[PDB]
Amino acid sequence: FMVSLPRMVYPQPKVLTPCRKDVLVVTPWLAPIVWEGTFNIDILNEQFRLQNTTIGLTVFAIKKYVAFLKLFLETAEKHFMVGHRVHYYVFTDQPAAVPRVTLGTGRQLSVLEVRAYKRWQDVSMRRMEMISCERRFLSEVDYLVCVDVDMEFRDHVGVEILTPLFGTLHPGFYGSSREAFTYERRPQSQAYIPKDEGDFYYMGAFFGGSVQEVQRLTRACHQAMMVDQANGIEAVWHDESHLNKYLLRHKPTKVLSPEYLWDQQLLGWPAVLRKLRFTAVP
Numbered sequence: 001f002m003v004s005l006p007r008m009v010y011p012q013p014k015v016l017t018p019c020r021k022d023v024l025v026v027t028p029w030l031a032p033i034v035w036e037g038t039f040n041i042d043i044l045n046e047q048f049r050l051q052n053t054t055i056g057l058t059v060f061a062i063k064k065y066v067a068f069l070k071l072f073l074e075t076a077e078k079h080f081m082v083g084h085r086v087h088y089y090v091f092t093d094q095p096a097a098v099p100r101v102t103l104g105t106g107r108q109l110s111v112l113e114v115r116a117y118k119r120w121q122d123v124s125m126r127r128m129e130m131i132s133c134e135r136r137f138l139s140e141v142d143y144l145v146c147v148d149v150d151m152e153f154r155d156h157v158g159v160e161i162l163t164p165l166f167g168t169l170h171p172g173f174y175g176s177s178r179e180a181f182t183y184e185r186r187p188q189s190q191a192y193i194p195k196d197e198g199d200f201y202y203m204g205a206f207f208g209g210s211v212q213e214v215q216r217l218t219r220a221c222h223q224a225m226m227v228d229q230a231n232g233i234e235a236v237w238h239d240e241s242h243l244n245k246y247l248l249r250h251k252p253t254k255v256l257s258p259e260y261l262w263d264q265q266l267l268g269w270p271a272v273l274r275k276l277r278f279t280a281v282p
């Protein structure tokens with residue numbers, strides 16, 4: 001049950017004037033594509049605070065990648081879901097190397113010890129098995145957000161992203177034709193997508209949704225990866241390839257623009273990006 005919003009004063013949305021004319025702001029299945037200028041954060045914050053929303057953030061820091069946690073967490077404290085309840089879940093092979101980062105009120109961090117795989121490919125992929133922790137998330141958070149650690153927040157990432165299931169447009173492919181998408185192209189793989197299929201190329205570094213939908217996605221991807229392994233094939237881009245197959249066949253209910261996953265070193269700062277929110281660390 002949802003209580004009424006309070007009286008709020010804000011500019012009237014004008015039907016005969018788009019918020020953005022330069023970009024697609026809704027998919028053909030009527031999912032919003034989240035860009036700066038498309039949302040009033042005050043309205044959204046009200047809607048989500050009235051539900052006492054808790055957001056879980058999962059992040060893997062294995063072997064040398066523990067070095068990225070301090071900046072990741074400090075910047076998340078400045079920019080990620082500020083004002084809302086947040087539970088970070090840090091999955092690591094080195095619990096003692098997790099930095100002691102000072103957290104704001106209503107925010108907590110759990111360190112979860114996992115095994116370290118030799119191959120970075122396996123480390124990256126095996127994130128699906130670990131996320132699929134099932135009993136824990138259901139009791140503790142409403143939404144799960146799954147991100148890479150070699151990153152920093154530079155601007156607001158908030159409740160505008162929350163929805164049953166979301167993916168993020170990969171910054172290298174948002175302007176590309178589908179034939180250029182680096183989907184898995186071998187029919188022998190469960191991740192296979194033909195040249196005439198595909199909506200978007202989503203990045204493995206930022207996806208999420210409700211706990212139920214995220215655990216459906218991660219279970220499905222893990223099972224598909226196990227089939228591939230049994231068949232002696234490894235998808236070209238690992239769990240990202242599987243994530244893309246899943247989101248082709250199960251359309252996300254929001255899509256995040258590349259504001260939400262950017263690499264300024266490789267791609268600069270195009271005019272179409274009004275904000276750079278969450279960016280790669282060299």
Ligand SMILES: O=c1ccn([C@@H]2O[C@H](COP(=O)(O)OP(=O)(O)O)[C@@H](O)[C@H]2O)c(=O)[nH]1
Pocket residue numbers: 059060061062063064065066120123124147148149150205
């Ligand atoms: O040795 C490793 C390799 C990978 N990862 C995790 O898997 C994610 C994806 O790998 P990576 O960031 O290297 O992929 P890329 O962004 O370079 O494509 C990393 O962000 C980490 O969260 C890790 O913790 N230790």
Ligand SMILES: [Mn+2]
Pocket residue numbers: 148149150205
């Ligand atoms: Mn990364």
